[PDB]
Amino acid sequence: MLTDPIADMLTRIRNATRVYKESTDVPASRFKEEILRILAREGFIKGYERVDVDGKPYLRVYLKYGPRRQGPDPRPEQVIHHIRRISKPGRRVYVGVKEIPRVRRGLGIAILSTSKGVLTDREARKLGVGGELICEVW
């Protein structure tokens, strides 16, 4: 019955890419949008459109991967290697703005919800706010 729909999505994504796949369809939600609307704006996906599967409104999300490779296991590097949720449903994690994580030494993003929108580690620091550290991606 999905406890935390997000960490689901987040996983759907994670799972799709391990085999490298056109797209995948998290069941839709304005918030799952918002979140996706940052994976893409930050270059982790090609992006996403709204769709349907029997009146049921999901989100077609187009993944991004690397270039082919020489040698054995020519499988591409990942645009999204790592994506693991924080502030979980069984233990919300919040943060003051000074408390905000510095993911992967700048090479990464810490998506996170706040009173002035779903910012990012830099977007929040710059906007000078904090809130539910939603997850870390890279």
Partner 1 sequence: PKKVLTGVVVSDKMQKTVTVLVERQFPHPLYGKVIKRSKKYLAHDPEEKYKLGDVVEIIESRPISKRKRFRVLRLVESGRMDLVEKYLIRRQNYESLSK
Partner 2 sequence: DFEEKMILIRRTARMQAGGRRFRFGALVVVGDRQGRVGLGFGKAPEVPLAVQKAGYYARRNMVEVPLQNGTIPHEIEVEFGASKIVLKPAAPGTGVIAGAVPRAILELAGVTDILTKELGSRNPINIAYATMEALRQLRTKADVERLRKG
Partner 3 sequence: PTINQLVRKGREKVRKKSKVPALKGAPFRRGVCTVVRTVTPKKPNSALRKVAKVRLTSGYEVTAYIPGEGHNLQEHSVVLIRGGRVKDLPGVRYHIVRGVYDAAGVKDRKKSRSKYGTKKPKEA
Partner RNA sequence: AGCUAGUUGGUGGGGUAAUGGCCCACCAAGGCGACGACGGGUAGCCGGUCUGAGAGGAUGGCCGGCCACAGGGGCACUGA
Partner RNA sequence: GGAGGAAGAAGCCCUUCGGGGUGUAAACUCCUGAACCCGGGACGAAACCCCCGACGAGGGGACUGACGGUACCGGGGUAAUAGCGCCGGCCAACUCCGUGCCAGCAGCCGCGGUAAUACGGAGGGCGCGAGCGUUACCCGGAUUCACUGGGCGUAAAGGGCGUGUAGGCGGCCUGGGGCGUCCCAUGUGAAAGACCACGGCUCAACCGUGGGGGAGCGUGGGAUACGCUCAGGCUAGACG
Partner RNA sequence: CCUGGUCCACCCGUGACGCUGAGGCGCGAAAGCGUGGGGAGCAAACCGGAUUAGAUACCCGGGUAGUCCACGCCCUAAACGAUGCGCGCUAGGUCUCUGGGUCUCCUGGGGGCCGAAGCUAACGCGUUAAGCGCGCCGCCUGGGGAGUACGGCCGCAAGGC
Partner RNA sequence: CCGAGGGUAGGGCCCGUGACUGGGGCGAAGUCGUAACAAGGUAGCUGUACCGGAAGGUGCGGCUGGA
106 interacts with partner 2 by CB under 8 A: yes
Residue 28 interface partner, choices partner 3, RNA, partner 1, none, CB cut-off 5-8 Å depending on type:
RNA
Out of 92, 102, 116, 126, which residue is the one contacting partner 1 (CB under 8 A)?
92
DSSP code per residue over 1-27: --SSHHHHHHHHHHHHHTT--SEEEEE
Tell the smallest beta-carbon distance from residue 66 to partner 2 (Å).
Answer: 6
> Are the C-beta atoms of 108 and 44 separated by less than 8 Å?
no
**Can you tell me whether residue 15 is helix, strand or coil?**
helix
Residue 92 interface partner, choices partner 1, partner 2, partner 3, none, CB cut-off 5-8 Å depending on type:
partner 1
Tokens 């709204």 sit on residue: 50
Out of 18, 30, 91, 98, which residue is the one contacting partner 3 (CB under 8 A)?
91
64 interacts with partner 2 by CB under 8 A: yes
Give the number of other Cβ atoms within 10 Å of residue 62's Cβ.
14
Residue 105 interface partner, choices partner 1, partner 2, RNA, none, CB cut-off 5-8 Å depending on type:
partner 2
Burial class of residue 49, CB neighbours in 10 A (0-12, 13-18, 19+): exposed
Q: Look at residues 73, 133, 48, 70 and name the one whose alpha carbon lies nearest to residue 97.
A: 133
> Are the C-beta atoms of 49 and 23 separated by less than 8 Å?
no
84 interacts with partner 3 by CB under 8 A: no
Residues within the interface to partner 3 (CB under 8 A) = 88, 90-91
Residues within the interface to partner 2 (CB under 8 A) = 42-44, 46, 64, 66, 77, 79, 104-107
